[PDB]
Homo-oligomer: 311 residues x 4
Amino acid sequence: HLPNITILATGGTIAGVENLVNAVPQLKDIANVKGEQVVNIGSQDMNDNVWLTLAKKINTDCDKTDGFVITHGTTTMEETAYFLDLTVKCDKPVVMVGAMRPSTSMSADGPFNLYNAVVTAADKASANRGVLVVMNDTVLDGRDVTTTNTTDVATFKSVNYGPLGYIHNGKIDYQRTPARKHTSDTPFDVSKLNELPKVGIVYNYANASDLPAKALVDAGYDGIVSAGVGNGNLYKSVFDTLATAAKTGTAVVRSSRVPTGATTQDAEVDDAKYGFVASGTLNPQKARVLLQLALTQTKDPQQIQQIFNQY
Amino acid sequence: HLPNITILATGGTIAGNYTVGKVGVENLVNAVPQLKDIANVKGEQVVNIGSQDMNDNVWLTLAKKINTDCDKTDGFVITHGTTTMEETAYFLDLTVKCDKPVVMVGAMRPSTSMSADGPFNLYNAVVTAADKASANRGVLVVMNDTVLDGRDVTTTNTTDVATFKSVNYGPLGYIHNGKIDYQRTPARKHTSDTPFDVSKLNELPKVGIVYNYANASDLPAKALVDAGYDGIVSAGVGNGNLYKSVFDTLATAAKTGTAVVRSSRVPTGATTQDAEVDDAKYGFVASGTLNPQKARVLLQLALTQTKDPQQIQQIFNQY
Amino acid sequence: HLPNITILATGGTIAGVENLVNAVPQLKDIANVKGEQVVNIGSQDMNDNVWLTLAKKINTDCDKTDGFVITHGTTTMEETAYFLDLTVKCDKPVVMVGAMRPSTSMSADGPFNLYNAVVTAADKASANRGVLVVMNDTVLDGRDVTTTNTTDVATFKSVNYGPLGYIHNGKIDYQRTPARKHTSDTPFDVSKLNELPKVGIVYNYANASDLPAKALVDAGYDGIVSAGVGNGNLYKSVFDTLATAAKTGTAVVRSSRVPTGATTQDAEVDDAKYGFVASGTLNPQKARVLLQLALTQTKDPQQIQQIFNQY
Amino acid sequence: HLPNITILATGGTIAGNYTVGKVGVENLVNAVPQLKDIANVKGEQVVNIGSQDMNDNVWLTLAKKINTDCDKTDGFVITHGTTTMEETAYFLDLTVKCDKPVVMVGAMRPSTSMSADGPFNLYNAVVTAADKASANRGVLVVMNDTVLDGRDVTTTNTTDVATFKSVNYGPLGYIHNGKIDYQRTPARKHTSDTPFDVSKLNELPKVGIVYNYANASDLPAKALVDAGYDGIVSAGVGNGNLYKSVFDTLATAAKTGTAVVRSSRVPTGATTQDAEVDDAKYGFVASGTLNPQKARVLLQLALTQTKDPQQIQQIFNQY
């Protein structure tokens, strides 16, 4: 008997969604595959609406299948994978997958990527590891996974703590598992939410303008993430505006433009004095995901920093 | 006789039996006696700010200083914080007309901490500035025993002493026992080969940076447009793509004469011309391998020469 | 009250062994530190004798202390760390540490490395993770840890599955733990052994000579590890000699000269037909360590391959 | 008109509506029709062996072939297995006298497998060989959309399609939409700049490779010495250090005229001269950034010109 695997498509086909078993016939060797098109967007236009639709669809469909494969554009797959990692309560494998080359282009990466994603979704050993991304023969956790290169087929890496397992000949040797709390160990429950808190991201650099930061504060954003320089440091005029945000009802999280390493609490900036949160290893777009969800439960920066310290 | 090397300091000491004085750079030199073995060192404290508050006016003061003092010394080392070094290095790479080595240096640990990186990093920067073979390679960054070109160099890790790398095209050479095996030189045009001359400039064109992500707000890109910014750099997703509403604001801006450069939040690889975005229809410029903060430096300088998007693209193709 | 930490020195001082608390006085803030010089060799001369002396000394001294820090030259620290990972039955932190710069050289890395190693040995959270290496603000597992660069202070990486935790301001955020069985979950017991099986390593390349391989076979080695090309492939004349070794009493393990990735069982070479074992992610010098210990229990290649599949 | 490019095949097809013939390289070309868009392609099957059984005689046949046929074509692509490509590429880098592009290519997946890398890799190798800007950069490796110099290129991962990298000095350029932005060229002397001429050679000097590790046996290094090998490369620990008993055998050998090169099992960085080992006392040569298999290629060729350890070191300093 082979596992039942639901492929949820968010966009264009990566090898329509009901044809994938004929476009990649090897799938019939490993699974009984059923396809649903949940939405159809370019990944560069991903949004909160699509996030909620997916977490609700997986949590509702958990009983109907043995595992999920989500097909998704590469540009924001790291964002969607972490949102799902925190909001999904289904304990069955959820595996995200995309393609750095078009399906019609030479040596297209989609077919094998889809095959390997199905392998991962079918593997008993894949349960209880949080939401996964499978790209380039590798199983990565939805928390640390990011894109490292604009075009490379091998772009997706877990740049801080590394991959969970490598896939060879339809087999996974898992050697690691994310200790950070995920899926049904989080208190984030989006079953009844139809919007998320307003969180924007502002960039730091030499002679940075406070205008982006002031635009979000004047819009009344619930949250702002700073893509800091070095260990989450802030250009003076940005630092001034955020200091104002934090004492007037905008949660402020210090992340980093630097691609690897933690932004560490009270090391470069007096977080306690300013009412700021340090993102740790969460890059600015991941720290947005968790800020949004922290803001569904609390606006107390000491409670948001504890959230940033276990999820 | 030993070469004459100037240290130009922009902030704190990265290193440090001697009396501490009021001048940071004078304590620095006493903190690293072995410098006497390789150079006649002279320090000047140009400014004293944290690198997280680096700005246009420090960039103008340094380029002008290096250009003015070129005949006075055999080389320059600049002590600089790590957070924005990659931006200042590229600025100086495009605007220095001196063909003597200009080497930037910093440290990821405090000078007081255990196993402070600053003292050795400074020694290796002076080694580099003293090497006749360092000349005509552009402005350089020397960190963790490695020579990095100012164009491609970036910080990869928030705390690692080894964070500085040329993430696309790799290092120029490695330093062992005070000697450099140079195997590489940047092909993009730099220093006396660029048309950018900052010698009479008081100020630089205004260029802001917007981030793209899921559900991105247009409000940062609108704020820059309403302030009438000369240029905006987009930190795009994947190969420079933009969120729909950010796209919409920047498409309108380009139409009314804002210069728009697509860069990427992705830490390696080119944002390539007309690939994910018809740059020709919109009047956008692709940044190449330049990261958002690096593309800002080139866009500011491009805008001193031209406001035409097609000439700006050819600039982003040559420098 | 502060933890009791035993520093075992194998060689020259990295900041004599009883002075380290005065050379790095910050240690008195985190631990009560006692030093023993177990042996004094250059790490390039490391050997089986020194291995057994250490595992016996730690297993015997486990009751007398809260944790161990071993000071060791960088050239073979990856070898000693895995030997100890497999042979130590003490459940208290054992942390290996060295220095890529001399203690007397400018910006010497030893002091902080020693401090951070003591931090790791003192951390409750460090128990039960196997034998650790702490280099360059990073906690790495003794299985995957290797040197990547001849001179860099940041050389030590876990190149396949990544680090366990990063150390900031005397604090570890552990986010990973090796799933491979270690310490008291292995059957390797060296308490009564005074030598180990004879295992040598032979290199593959274009026009490789069979002479190295034939020298080990004629010496009657218990084991040979091949540093294969690509996915553990063998130059014809090497392949011929090893095929002969395996059917006449020499266990043969296929590793790789390639610095990352597994040598995978029966993918490039018919392991079952030749009586060979595939090393997986174990590089040639690590696969030697585990072959030596597998050979203390069995000479059946199917039993050695199962050993290579869980340790 | 399109450039004329020769494919020289050494084994299996890396790619593959057509009739399959007995000649691998003829099936290869039919398997990648889009080649017609960029080149007039002509294939020759030079040899047919697995790359794990690469040898001196294939290296001699290829260099001689490229050198002989240089006037007949605009460029060369060599199809080669991945396991030893890095060795053949460097051999050809030192012995090709043709200054037209020579591009090596392979594939990490089977041509039959899903998402086979071979077809696109071959297209990108032909693109590279067809680019006038590829010339005078040495023998090249093109894999996963990247141009790598034959000196520094190596395989980093047993299975990854992205395994090939220039791990010390980085890539020469990246390929996007059939176009290469070259930002780098190898400074070490290659091709028509080396003194190695293989045109009359029937065979190469015998050079073996010994591994170092804890408790290393001397028996491999003794076997090579007793066979009277012209040279031995040591895969040292850290910065080329040797286990005591391996040291002992190689010290004795060097004394009786065996050439001894210290390389390292460590996958990046230089093995540096008189640093961890007094090379002057022992008559040893430091390999630099060359890995053991790369140092063997240069040592074999060094030994066609000289057996003096000091001249061999200067060769390891220049090529």
